[PDB]
Design an enzyme around this catalytic site. Structure first.
Site, mmCIF file in Angstrom:
data_model
loop_
_atom_site.group_PDB
_atom_site.id
_atom_site.type_symbol
_atom_site.label_atom_id
_atom_site.label_comp_id
_atom_site.label_asym_id
_atom_site.label_seq_id
_atom_site.Cartn_x
_atom_site.Cartn_y
_atom_site.Cartn_z
ATOM 1 N N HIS A 1 -8.819 -12.877 -9.707
ATOM 2 C CA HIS A 1 -8.840 -12.558 -11.614
ATOM 3 C C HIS A 1 -9.509 -13.639 -12.206
ATOM 4 O O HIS A 1 -9.838 -13.196 -13.558
ATOM 5 C CB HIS A 1 -7.072 -11.968 -12.179
ATOM 6 C CG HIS A 1 -6.713 -10.786 -11.611
ATOM 7 N ND1 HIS A 1 -5.216 -10.657 -11.359
ATOM 8 C CD2 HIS A 1 -7.383 -9.619 -10.716
ATOM 9 C CE1 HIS A 1 -4.811 -9.451 -11.190
ATOM 10 N NE2 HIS A 1 -6.952 -8.932 -10.407
ATOM 11 N N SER B 1 -14.122 -9.124 -9.278
ATOM 12 C CA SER B 1 -14.533 -9.124 -8.743
ATOM 13 C C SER B 1 -16.249 -9.026 -8.352
ATOM 14 O O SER B 1 -17.102 -9.408 -8.475
ATOM 15 C CB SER B 1 -13.991 -7.354 -8.888
ATOM 16 O OG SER B 1 -12.626 -7.639 -8.271
ATOM 17 N N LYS C 1 -7.314 6.346 -8.619
ATOM 18 C CA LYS C 1 -7.886 6.117 -6.296
ATOM 19 C C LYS C 1 -7.662 5.210 -5.848
ATOM 20 O O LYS C 1 -7.114 5.396 -4.825
ATOM 21 C CB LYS C 1 -8.984 5.303 -7.369
ATOM 22 C CG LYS C 1 -9.622 4.973 -5.636
ATOM 23 C CD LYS C 1 -11.262 4.547 -6.464
ATOM 24 C CE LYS C 1 -12.834 4.316 -5.711
ATOM 25 N NZ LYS C 1 -11.990 3.582 -4.431
ATOM 26 N N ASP C 2 -5.923 4.711 -6.532
ATOM 27 C CA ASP C 2 -5.059 3.816 -5.082
ATOM 28 C C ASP C 2 -4.080 4.461 -4.653
ATOM 29 O O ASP C 2 -3.575 4.438 -3.557
ATOM 30 C CB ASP C 2 -5.355 2.448 -5.494
ATOM 31 C CG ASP C 2 -5.937 1.029 -5.836
ATOM 32 O OD1 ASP C 2 -7.314 1.868 -5.411
ATOM 33 O OD2 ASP C 2 -5.638 0.641 -6.971
ATOM 34 N N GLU D 1 0.385 -6.367 21.902
ATOM 35 C CA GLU D 1 -0.306 -5.048 21.588
ATOM 36 C C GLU D 1 -1.689 -4.922 20.923
ATOM 37 O O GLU D 1 -2.291 -5.859 20.729
ATOM 38 C CB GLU D 1 0.924 -4.503 19.667
ATOM 39 C CG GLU D 1 1.418 -3.653 19.582
ATOM 40 C CD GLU D 1 1.713 -2.314 19.785
ATOM 41 O OE1 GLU D 1 1.739 -2.503 21.576
ATOM 42 O OE2 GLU D 1 0.284 -1.040 19.566
HETATM 43 C C1 HEM Z 1 -2.390 -10.907 3.883
HETATM 44 C C2 HEM Z 1 -3.622 -9.594 3.977
HETATM 45 C C3 HEM Z 1 -4.123 -9.606 2.415
HETATM 46 C C4 HEM Z 1 -3.592 -8.749 1.621
HETATM 47 C C5 HEM Z 1 -2.513 -8.532 0.471
HETATM 48 C C6 HEM Z 1 -4.865 -9.538 0.308
HETATM 49 C C7 HEM Z 1 -4.693 -8.380 -0.802
HETATM 50 C C8 HEM Z 1 -6.057 -8.312 -1.568
HETATM 51 C C9 HEM Z 1 -6.076 -7.475 -2.765
HETATM 52 C C10 HEM Z 1 -5.070 -6.687 -3.595
HETATM 53 C C11 HEM Z 1 -6.710 -8.142 -3.558
HETATM 54 C C12 HEM Z 1 -7.588 -7.383 -4.692
HETATM 55 C C13 HEM Z 1 -8.711 -5.838 -4.263
HETATM 56 C C14 HEM Z 1 -9.071 -5.485 -3.068
HETATM 57 O O1 HEM Z 1 -11.121 -6.638 -4.189
HETATM 58 O O2 HEM Z 1 -9.755 -5.364 -2.123
HETATM 59 C C15 HEM Z 1 -7.655 -8.380 -2.612
HETATM 60 C C16 HEM Z 1 -8.805 -9.598 -2.308
HETATM 61 C C17 HEM Z 1 -10.342 -10.271 -1.293
HETATM 62 N N1 HEM Z 1 -9.461 -11.150 -0.157
HETATM 63 FE FE1 HEM Z 1 -7.785 -9.844 0.247
HETATM 64 N N2 HEM Z 1 -5.967 -10.144 1.262
HETATM 65 C C18 HEM Z 1 -5.463 -9.854 2.400
HETATM 66 C C19 HEM Z 1 -6.008 -10.659 2.869
HETATM 67 C C20 HEM Z 1 -7.743 -11.606 3.345
HETATM 68 C C21 HEM Z 1 -8.245 -11.760 4.692
HETATM 69 C C22 HEM Z 1 -7.814 -11.956 5.119
HETATM 70 C C23 HEM Z 1 -9.075 -12.170 3.955
HETATM 71 C C24 HEM Z 1 -10.758 -13.017 4.019
HETATM 72 C C25 HEM Z 1 -10.857 -14.335 4.353
HETATM 73 C C26 HEM Z 1 -9.438 -11.615 2.506
HETATM 74 C C27 HEM Z 1 -10.737 -11.429 1.389
HETATM 75 C C28 HEM Z 1 -10.497 -11.540 -0.011
HETATM 76 C C29 HEM Z 1 -11.705 -11.106 -0.626
HETATM 77 C C30 HEM Z 1 -12.546 -12.017 -0.147
HETATM 78 C C31 HEM Z 1 -11.920 -10.044 -1.613
HETATM 79 C C32 HEM Z 1 -12.233 -9.863 -3.160
HETATM 80 C C33 HEM Z 1 -13.486 -9.196 -2.950
HETATM 81 C C34 HEM Z 1 -13.841 -7.902 -3.858
HETATM 82 O O3 HEM Z 1 -13.489 -8.754 -5.367
HETATM 83 O O4 HEM Z 1 -14.788 -7.894 -3.739
HETATM 84 N N3 HEM Z 1 -8.432 -11.289 2.090
HETATM 85 N N4 HEM Z 1 -7.265 -9.031 -1.000
#
Ligand code: HEM
Ligand SMILES: CCCCCCCCCCCCCCCCCC(=O)OC[C@H](COP(=O)(O)OCCN)OC(=O)CCCCCCCCCCCCCCCCC
Ligand SMILES: CCCCCCCCCCCCCCCCCC(=O)OC[C@H](COP(=O)(O)OCCN)OC(=O)CCCCCCCCCCCCCCCCC
Ligand code: HEC
Ligand code: HEM
Ligand code: FES
Lengths: 98, 55, 49, 65, 73, 239, 100, 378, 54
Positions: free
Chosen positions: H200, H204, H226-227, H270
């Site tokens: 934020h 995005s 959508k979610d 697993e």
């Molecule tokens: C613990 C598990 C994770 C959760 C709960 C999580 C949660 C989220 C959420 C809620 C968002 C915002 C919504 C979205 O853009 O899809 C997000 C964005 C993002 N996450 Fe994670 N995330 C996790 C793990 C990761 C991992 C492992 C990566 C890779 C290193 C990652 C990379 C990103 C990126 C690059 C965004 C921005 C995507 C965009 O703006 O299009 N996340 N994450």
């Protein structure tokens, strides 16, 4: 004070006292027939005693030693050449071999 | 058909809450009836109610 | 210029009740609103149950 | 007692795969009787025969039972 | 990244939007959706699938060679 | 050898995506387990209260529990007398110790039949073919202390074939072949593995009717509120 | 040379002539590209944000333009490259002045 | 003026869920953020009920779990929700990472690094939870991975007798892993809040990779429904998995009690940890294996430092698109090879799949990128 | 280990056999008592100096 508190907590996570209460045993080899392994629990790991064939000894004396990544003759591994006494766990990552 | 339905149950909000509660209860009743009907219609025979009726 | 601005025609997209320009909107609003609110009500009943 | 399973097993080995497996087991029997006192002792033939026979048993049994 | 208002700078751009109660739910969902999904499929399978048919060949060939190694005995 | 054999696919009555078990078959399988298989194996986590509403009634449950007297605590004297056991007992273990289990067999710890369906590769079909396919080795003699059965990793079981054509001849007509006793004990082991197959299929059916209802309609609301952006149009005016 | 044939086939199959975009509507924006975008005349800048807003609209509906409005390789009016070259040259000159 | 724009809580809720400017272009692949959030709170809740019915000791752990799945009302569906929710949690986590790697969202730095730390934390948490049921596979998985920690010289053996809670997998190991599995998802929730905070801050992405500063639409009420749609699809997949074939993904070999003497033949994780185990046993060296695993996830750390292209997405680069699908098929190949025994064709193609994984990432992405930079006259 | 047969024996095992586990157990209990001491000092401050206008 901080490093002593950290040392006391790491020593709290180290072990116990009753876990350090594990020591020797005596194991009997009379029951085992030819060419077979028997296991015994000791320090949370199995304990192999295997009776072997003299032909297995002869083949193992025929195979070379310098190709082995730990060079060791079979007579270095055992006192009486067929009754082999082992700690039955693979030394890579902790498994019992088949 | 639809106009009376919007004129009654969808202008105000409290009436909408009342009809979703009453609809959820009626759906509870009829849905459990249909669910047990289908489930003891595809397993006719090998179910404990008829075996109880043997006794 | 602002009199040169003419809103395009969405006749592929409108509901079939409101296709013609003659038929009014206040005389047929409740069926459309009740259909969409009926969909939301059935969703809400399913979620709550 | 009239067993159904032995009935199904004796009546299902008419199929061609089970026949060819039967002759595979018999030729392995001829082999280890021929090259006698050996260390190659008829595994695949018996497992393949049980494979084919029990699959045709699986296809057409529980109707009778 | 912030709230609305101070993001970009746009000159003269006109946007029309119809009411959602005015228009249908699914506009021609089975006369344009099928050509659109066939078009988007034809524009992606030639970049997605030729690794996966290689995976299918690797799976079948590895199964066949393990049965080759064990079915002689 | 290490040529494992996959057991075949058998058309069970609990094979389908909504079918249930046969409770009369569970009852027959429990009579089998009481009179045959409970002399060597153990099924620790099946108490008699699981049998009250599933297959039997409650009266024959008290009868079956008062057939076998188990154990009780001190009678304020420390002597550990014999209690008939009303309903709350687990099934009586034949052997106290694992060493006691090895001390009456050729080694060969008898596995515990609460989870043998869910614990081996292949379901109850493995148990069916293991109980069934006792045959003879072509050439391999092993020690004559163990028996030959090909649906087994290692290809030599230490279990005698415990069925052999009418050892039970139970309540109704239903003559004890190999097939009837093996089908009943596989059904009973599937029941003892998963105690709630029936209620699982019931909630699965209610859920399929759920996702028949909601999935057009939440998607309809999404399509409705997103039907503003799917039809907005643009134009570019310069000065 | 046939490498121009590769470039023409690549500009056809690259997917950014489909959505009505020209060559410099898809540039990734670090600080340098943000500066080169800020250094633009007004008409090109308004045409740029309009083509970008049409591209986001057409990818929202996942519909791609008719045959008569695809951007063609023969009239490739790439325009952002001189300003971007000037930004890179002044940035490298400042970097070299810091290094020595 | 308004309740929402002055209140200190509702400013946070306003900049999160209501008037957050989100792009008007994001496809279904941008649902897995909310799906990982809903899976995480579902894991926390159903695991909390399981922890209310669980006794962590090596005598009675398996007995207590059997008591849950037989005697407590609905303990079987809550336990199956927990296990298959772990499985669907890692499905949505790898789809989330695949999105963030394919669409060029790894140009973000701090969000990406906090992401990788979240990946480490969820993998360690799910392994400790898989140790908890105290079956045969859990016993030997704990033993082998603790000796993998003992592989490193000068640090290892003391560290591993330190976290063993003794000299083998004793009572203390089961209680330690109960406590750390029972605390680590709250740290995962806090780092998820930090992850979302840096997002934020920046803003995005979109499937084109063009910055979408002109066409932001508010989050509510478009992406909220959508979610909700994505959540209903996830719950129906999760619930059909737990109500029709609960054993289709789980191990058969778990359900035996923990005998420390047997060592079954087909030892395996697993299914989500197969490729970590496939890089390990396809290199005949101890330190080389554990270092290659740690270097795999550190290669995922490395990935922002090799963005030498000049578009952002891989939507417009077909060569790198085909190479990315080769990478996806290669990771699925590693998962399949890890889920097999170890023999001669499996040895060869496991070694070749690990080599081709490292060759695709560390070499083929910049070579495809420099052919892209050459080919469009830049 | 929360089991009613061996819960009290587990706490005794903490206090006697584990290295410094007695210092951690007594630190937890007396820290709870000092926690409620500091809490009632905090509420007393907040009531006496009129911080309850927030
Ligand atoms: C613990 C598990 C994770 C959760 C709960 C999580 C949660 C989220 C959420 C809620 C968002 C915002 C919504 C979205 O853009 O899809 C997000 C964005 C993002 N996450 Fe994670 N995330 C996790 C793990 C990761 C991992 C492992 C990566 C890779 C290193 C990652 C990379 C990103 C990126 C690059 C965004 C921005 C995507 C965009 O703006 O299009 N996340 N994450
Ligand atoms: C089993 C895997 C199943 C994958 C199924 C993918 C289906 C969609 C494929 C497809 O259509 O790909 C092309 C598309 C192009 O992008 P877009 O602009 O959205 O499309 C418009 C025109 N096609 O691209 C897409 O639609 C999405 C492209 C892929 C995004 C998801 C990546 C998949 C998961 C990767 C997991 C591994 C990531 C690395 C993990 C490392 C761990 C150590
Ligand atoms: C308690 C021991 C006595 C402390 C004492 O005498 O404090 C004196 C001090 C005087 O306060 P005052 O004269 O206003 O300030 C002078 C500054 N120039 O007064 C103070 O500092 C008062 C501040 C502390 C008041 C609370 C101390 C006791 C804590 C428990 C209170 C419980 C309240 C109710 C909770 C349950 C309901
Ligand atoms: C005492 C002679 C037994 C009786 C009566 C039954 N079983 Fe048995 N069984 C026995 C032993 C000593 C063993 C162990 C052999 C080994 O090498 O494991 C077994 C084994 C089984 C198994 C597991 C075999 C496997 O697949 O690993 C099963 C499923 C089994 N036994 C079932 C079973 C049933 C259903 C019985 C009643 C009909 C039964 N056994 C009787 C000893 C004895
Ligand atoms: C703080 C929240 C959590 C709690 C309270 C919790 C609690 C538990 C409990 C009590 C068990 C033992 C019951 C069982 O084994 O079936 C368990 C097992 C398990 N947990 Fe968790 N857990 C939590 C978070 C997670 C997370 C985030 C994951 C990963 C997504 C996870 C994955 C697992 C797995 C895989 C098992 C083994 C399941 C099995 O084999 O039956 N848990 N958890
Ligand atoms: S080979 Fe890895 S533990 Fe024996």
């Amino acid at each position: 004070a901080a490093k002593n508190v950290v040392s006391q907590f790491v020593s709290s996570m180290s072990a116990s006292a009753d876990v350090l209460a594990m020591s020797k045993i005596e194991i009997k080899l009379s029951d085992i027939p030819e060419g077979k392994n028997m296991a015994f629990k000791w320090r949370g790991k199995p304990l192999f005693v295997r009776h072997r064939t003299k032909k297995e000894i002869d083949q193992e004396a025929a195979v070379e030693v310098s190709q082995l990544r730990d060079p060791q003759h079979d007579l270095e591994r055992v006192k009486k050449p067929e009754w082999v006494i082992l700690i039955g766990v693979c030394t890579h990552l902790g498994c019992v071999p088949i | 058909l639809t106009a009376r339905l919007y004129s009654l149950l969808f202008r105000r909000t409290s009436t909408f809450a009342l009809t979703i509660v009453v609809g959820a209860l009626f759906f509870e009743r009829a849905f459990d009836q249909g669910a047990d009907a289908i489930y003891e219609h595809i397993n006719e025979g090998k179910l404990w109610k008829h075996i109880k009726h043997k006794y | 210029s602002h009199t040169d601005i003419k809103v395009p025609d969405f006749s592929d997209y409108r509901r079939p009740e409101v296709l013609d320009s003659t038929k009014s909107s206040k005389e047929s609003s409740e069926a459309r609103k009740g259909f969409s609110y009926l969909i939301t009500a059935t969703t809400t009943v399913g979620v709550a149950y | 007692l009239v067993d159904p399973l032995t009935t199904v097993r004796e009546q299902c080995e008419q199929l061609e795969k089970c026949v060819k497996a039967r002759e595979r087991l018999e030729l392995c029997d001829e082999r280890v009787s021929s090259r006698s006192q050996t260390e190659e002792d008829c595994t695949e033939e018996l497992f393949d025969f049980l494979h084919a026979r029990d699959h045709c048993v699986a296809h057409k049994l529980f109707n009778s039972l | 990244g912030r709230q609305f208002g101070h993001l970009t700078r746009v000159r003269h751009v006109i946007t029309y939007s119809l009411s959602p109660f005015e228009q249908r739910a699914f506009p021609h969902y089975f006369s344009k959706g099928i050509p659109n999904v066939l078009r988007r499929t034809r524009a992606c399978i030639l970049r997605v699938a030729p690794p996966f048919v290689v995976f299918y060949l690797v799976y079948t060939w590895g199964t066949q060679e393990f049965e080759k190694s064990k079915r002689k005995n | 050898s290490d040529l494992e054999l996959h057991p075949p696919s058998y058309p069970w009555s609990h094979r389908g995506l909504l079918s249930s078990l046969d409770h009369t078959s569970i009852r027959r399988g429990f009579q089998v387990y009481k009179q045959v298989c409970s002399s060597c194996h153990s099924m620790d986590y099946v108490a008699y209260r699981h049998l009250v509403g599933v297959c039997y009634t409650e009266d024959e449950a008290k009868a079956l529990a008062e057939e076998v007297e188990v154990q009780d605590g001190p009678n304020e004297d420390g002597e550990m007398f014999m209690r008939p056991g009303k309903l709350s007992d687990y099934f009586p273990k034949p052997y106290p110790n694992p060493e006691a289990a090895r001390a009456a067999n050729n080694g060969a710890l008898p596995p515990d039949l609460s989870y043998i369906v869910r614990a081996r590769h292949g379901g109850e079909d493995y148990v069916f073919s293991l109980l069934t396919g006792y045959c003879e080795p072509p050439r391999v003699s092993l020690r004559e202390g163990l028996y030959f059965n090909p649906y087994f990793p290692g290809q030599a079981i230490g279990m005698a074939p415990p069925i052999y054509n009418e050892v039970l001849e139970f309540d109704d007509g239903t003559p004890a072949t190999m097939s009837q006793v093996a089908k009943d004990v596989c059904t009973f082991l599937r029941w003892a593995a998963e105690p709630e197959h029936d209620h699982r299929k019931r909630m699965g059916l209610k859920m399929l009717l759920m996702m028949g209802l909601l999935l057009p309609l939440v998607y309809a609301m999404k399509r409705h509120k997103w039907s503003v952006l799917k039809s907005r149009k643009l134009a570019y005016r310069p000065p | 040379k046939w490498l121009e044939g590769i470039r023409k086939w690549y500009y056809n199959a690259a997917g950014f002539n489909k959505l009505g975009l020209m060559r410099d509507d898809t540039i990734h924006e670090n600080d340098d590209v943000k500066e080169a975008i800020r250094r633009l005349p007004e008409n090109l800048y308004n045409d740029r944000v309009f083509r970008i807003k049409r591209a986001l609209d057409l990818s929202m509906r996942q519909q791609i333009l008719p045959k008569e409005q695809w951007t063609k390789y023969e009239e490739d009016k790439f325009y952002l490259e001189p300003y971007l070259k000037e930004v890179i040259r002044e940035r490298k000159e400042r970097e070299e002045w810091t290094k020595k | 003026i308004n309740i929402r724009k002055t209140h200190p809580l509702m400013k946070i809720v306003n900049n999160a869920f209501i008037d957050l400017p989100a792009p008007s272009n994001i496809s279904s692949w941008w649902n897995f953020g909310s799906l990982l959030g809903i899976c995480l709170i579902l894991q926390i809740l159903t695991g909390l009920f399981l922890a209310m019915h669980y006794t962590p000791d090596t005598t009675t752990a398996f007995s207590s779990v059997t008591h849950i799945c037989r005697d407590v009302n609905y303990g079987w569906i809550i336990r199956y929700m927990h296990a298959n929710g772990a499985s669907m949690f890692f499905i949505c986590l790898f789809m989330h990472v695949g999105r963030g790697l394919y669409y060029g969202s790894y140009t973000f730095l701090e969000t990406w690094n906090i992401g990788v730390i979240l990946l480490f934390a969820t993998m360690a948490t799910a392994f400790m939870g898989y140790v908890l049921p105290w079956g045969q596979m859990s016993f030997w998985g704990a033993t082998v991975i603790t000796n993998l920690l003992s592989a490193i010289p000068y640090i290892g053996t003391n560290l591993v007798e330190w976290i063993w809670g003794g000299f083998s997998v004793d009572k203390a190991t089961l209680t330690r892993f109960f406590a750390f599995h029972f605390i680590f998802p709250f740290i995962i929730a806090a780092l998820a809040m930090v992850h979302l905070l840096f997002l934020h801050e920046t803003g995005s992405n979109n499937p084109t990779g063009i910055p979408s500063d002109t066409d932001k639409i508010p989050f509510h009420p478009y992406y909220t429904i959508k979610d909700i749609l994505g959540a209903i699809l996830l719950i129906l997949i999760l619930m059909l998995l737990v109500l029709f074939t609960p054993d289709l993904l789980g191990d058969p070999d778990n359900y035996t009690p923990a005998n420390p003497l047997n060592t079954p033949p087909h030892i395996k994780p697993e299914w989500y940890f197969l490729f970590a185990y496939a890089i390990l046993r396809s290199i005949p060296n101890k330190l080389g294996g554990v270092l290659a695993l740690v270097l795999s996830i550190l290669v995922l750390v490395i990935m922002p430092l090799l963005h030498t292209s000049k578009q952002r997405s891989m939507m417009f680069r077909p060569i790198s698109q085909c190479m990315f699908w080769i990478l996806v098929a290669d990771l699925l190949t590693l998962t399949w090879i890890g889920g097999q025994p170890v023999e001669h064709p499996y040895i060869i193609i496991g070694q070749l799949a690990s080599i081709m994984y490292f060759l695709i990432i560390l070499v083929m992405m910049p070579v495809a990128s420099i052919i892209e930079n050459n080919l469009l006259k830049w």
